[PDB]
From TrEMBL, chain A:
Full-protein interval shown: 160 to 317 of 475
Binding site for Mg(2+) 1: 21, 25
Modification sites for N6-carboxylysine: 35
Residues annotated as binding Mg(2+) 2: 35, 37-38
Lineage: Archaea, Methanobacteriati, Methanobacteriota, Stenosarchaea group, Candidatus Methanofastidiosia
Superkingdom classification of source: Archaea
Originating gene: rbcL
Name of the protein in question: Ribulose bisphosphate carboxylase
Domain Ribulose bisphosphate carboxylase large subunit C-terminal residue range list: 1-158
UniProtKB/TrEMBL annotation, chain B:
Domain named Ribulose bisphosphate carboxylase large subunit ferrodoxin-like N-terminal: residues: 24-131
Shown segment, full-protein numbering: 7 to 159 of 475
Membrane spanning stretches: none
Species, as recorded: Candidatus Methanofastidiosum methylothiophilum
Top-level taxon in the UniProt lineage: Archaea
Protein name from the UniProt record: Ribulose bisphosphate carboxylase
Amino acid sequence: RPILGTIIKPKMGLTSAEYAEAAYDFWVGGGDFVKNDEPQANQDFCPYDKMVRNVKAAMDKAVKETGNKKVHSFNVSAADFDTMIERCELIRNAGFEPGSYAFLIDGITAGWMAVQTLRRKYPDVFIHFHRAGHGSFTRPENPIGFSVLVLSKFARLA
Amino acid sequence: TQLIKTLNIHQKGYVNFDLPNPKNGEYLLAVFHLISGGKLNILQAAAEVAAESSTGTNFNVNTETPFSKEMNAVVYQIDLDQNLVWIAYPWRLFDRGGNVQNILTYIVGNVLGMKEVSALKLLDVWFPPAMLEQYDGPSYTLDDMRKYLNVYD
Amino acid sequence: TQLIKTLNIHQKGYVNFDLPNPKNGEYLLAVFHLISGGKLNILQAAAEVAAESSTGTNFNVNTETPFSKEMNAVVYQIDLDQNLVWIAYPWRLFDRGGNVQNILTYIVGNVLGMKEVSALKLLDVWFPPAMLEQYDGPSYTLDDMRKYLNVYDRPILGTIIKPKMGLTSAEYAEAAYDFWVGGGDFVKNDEPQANQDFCPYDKMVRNVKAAMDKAVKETGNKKVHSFNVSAADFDTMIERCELIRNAGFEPGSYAFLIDGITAGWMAVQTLRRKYPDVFIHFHRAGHGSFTRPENPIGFSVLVLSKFARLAGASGIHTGHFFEQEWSKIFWRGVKKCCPIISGGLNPTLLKPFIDVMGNIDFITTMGAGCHPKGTTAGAKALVQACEAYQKGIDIKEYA
Amino acid sequence: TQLIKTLNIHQKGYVNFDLPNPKNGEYLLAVFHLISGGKLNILQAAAEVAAESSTGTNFNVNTETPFSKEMNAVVYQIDLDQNLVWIAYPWRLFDRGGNVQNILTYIVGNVLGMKEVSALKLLDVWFPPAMLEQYDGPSYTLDDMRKYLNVYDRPILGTIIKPKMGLTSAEYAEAAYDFWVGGGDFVKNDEPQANQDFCPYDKMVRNVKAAMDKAVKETGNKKVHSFNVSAADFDTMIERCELIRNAGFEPGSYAFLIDGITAGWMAVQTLRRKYPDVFIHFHRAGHGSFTRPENPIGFSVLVLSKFARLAGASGIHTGHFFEQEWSKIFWRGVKKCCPIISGGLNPTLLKPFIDVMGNIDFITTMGAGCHPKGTTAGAKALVQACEAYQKGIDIKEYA
Ligand SMILES: [Mg+2]
Ligand SMILES: [Mg+2]
Ligand SMILES: [Mg+2]
């Protein structure tokens, strides 16, 4: 079967505990995959470290109530590469079991360099390429750009 | 007025033409050239763009909180003749530590891929000083290069 | 309405009775008992309090910005008959990193010294979940100490050692052993008990360790001692903490006592963050100035307990206006802060007190309750009363 | 006499009107305003206060020792008409290592919460030289700041920035520069001004450094900024301190502000001992509960200032019963704690205030005094008034 995933609604404005509770609600219902919103980061009302800890607790609880393992996709897109590495290491040292966490990256806005840095620094982690911003290149209304197929091929290459 | 009546409640949560002061310092101001992508009016598509670019609550969800409503981007000005939409983004939405790509992800991210708009061009943004505090800005300038080169005029 | 017309424009900037949702999550809510200090009405003094406790713009200044107006604390509800003022504090005002003393500096700081109020008592506060996200809360709870002690179905039985001070390390440890072997689970240092010359701190720690070990051997039950770690500076507090750890007690057998008022909230937060696995015993010696009903200026015991829980205290001594839920939702919430009862609780009064509280989740450090049959006999009587209450048998029948 | 006959033996152990020499050097002397809380006379309540603040032996306990009796605090003088009680505390009771919070825990701790007193105000204390030995006192003084500023013969000119909060780091730094360039020497962070999200602490420090450098260049005179280093815990406070040091300001240009009441006395002592070369600015936000005259329970402003001096504060905000000399003799003595004046001191009122104080050794942070000709113009007028006072010329003549 396809891997069943969800986004948390509202996208933003939820606290770490509220977001973790929604993730647990989806997970305990049988869903396998929960992703951070593509701009979900160290916001002041949902701090990144608190969000990671609360998501870890919610995933643990969902795993116990289900027996099935669960996967959360953390947005590691940051201002700079140091903050991205810090957030990646914080996810690692939470500490989730390997395979339970995926690194989400905004490949367009954060850039292909961040995608390649994630790929080479964390080959054992699922590199979740979020393409927020691709519309300028890929939208059919835009005569200038490149196709979604080109973007997918270069994401695979990266 | 009538365009407001065309909105549903979730869309109404992202439109406030009576915003007291868009330049109060809490909002990144953004003006878009917006044309809706069929069957939607300009205000409905504007509300969809504001939702997708701030908090994405365009449907009834039991996880909605009043604080998440406080984080909503707001359409506060529209220009029907020029197809212009002004949206106020509470810059508390943006990642701390001066993350610019996060702002770009918010305001020119998934909104560009929405079928709700046939055209969506971010024409200008206005940064309040309180938001500008969070970001570095340039530290080396053309004046520094001029001083190194001893080139002026 | 008329009181609004009385205000000047700068005062008007701190009053908004049409605040759409005070519980929208952007505001810490605070209710004050306010009586103005002459020539001002209640709303004028309320606006002055809101200004002094948020941004202090009560005069025309060319440096005022619209964002600073956004950070204004707002009087949104008043009660003329009861002299009550509700003020909404945008919790963006407060220092980041879970700083509790910063909130106290804002809302019960310079406002207490203002001549504009003859009375100013912070009765209650309300924390939105978004703000509660910023603060640690307790990490070690009474449930953790119950798990260590293997004690349930009865309140944790504690004691103070009499005399409070002037005993040697061996004498104090002997009294602690007497209470422990009598069946008591909890012994606390006196709130000023520290490295005194006649009762050196290291000797007291070692002697308490030996007494606890022998009491555990004689009883089989684990025992808990609460050490006062309040010191001159942070280094001495951390040194005394590490000395307790490296004595070395078994984890769970020692609690860190801190004089949260005199030693300060910073020490409480430092203990919470450096030792999350240790019970943080919040002693409130000195709170009387803030909390005593005879003092019109201060804050209530409820406010102090709420802020102690926010700072991360595992338990606070105990001896309204907001429907406060300590989540964190509109990881799920904030852990409990255990009530600690002090003063003259003999087994005769144990059952009515448990009836009064309505639960068993509290520590009860007896004072003058039983301090000629021996302290061990009194502790045994207390344990027997607790077991009688658990069994549902009456005290007289159980006697 | 008759009140002595009213006492029981345990209460008698805390009363000695025949104390030979209260100033013999063994006792901290404390005078309280005491009113008993019903059914007790002044002497029984005084004995209860002395017991609860020294050794807590008001009942028959088999653990009582003669040495703990030697450690009893003693009521040695009473004033029936004025409801005054003098208590001598053997200062061996106090934690070693210069622990000030321990003394406060003893004498203004649990006694404030006692039901035995309806009013209990610590009016004054007296420190013997032998006790004064144990405590640091200030190490950086207003004279050190005068030497750095090359300012003498006039009070140090200070300001608070209005609005208190809600300004950006650049806006706050610009206001500080506006005051500094106008001749003002001293600018202080607001007492809750910290790492707020809209005014980050590091950015505020850097912008203040730039503004101070610009003001020094434009004036030639050195300038001082007081940074609020009150934080959540030890590590954040010392991190902010080190950030100020490594900005890097020239030594003497920065003072550390600490909210001594809310942040606590251990924070003040830690700042004193970790940064003896830095002016320790003691902000007393929250003191109103202890010190307000409307509050019958607490301690006076004089007691707070004396204990701030003992803890090592360079200066404390300001706005009897003992002949207290701050030596250290019956290195010679304890360094001075500078008074810090706050609130509306325009040049018109400057001369009478200097007459009232009797000396020019104080910082005066103006509030609503001058905050449309400009902050720089107001600071220049204040400096001109100071120079007129130094020259002896009248203000009207100098204008
Ligand atoms: Mg999304
Ligand atoms: Mg006690
Ligand atoms: Mg202030």
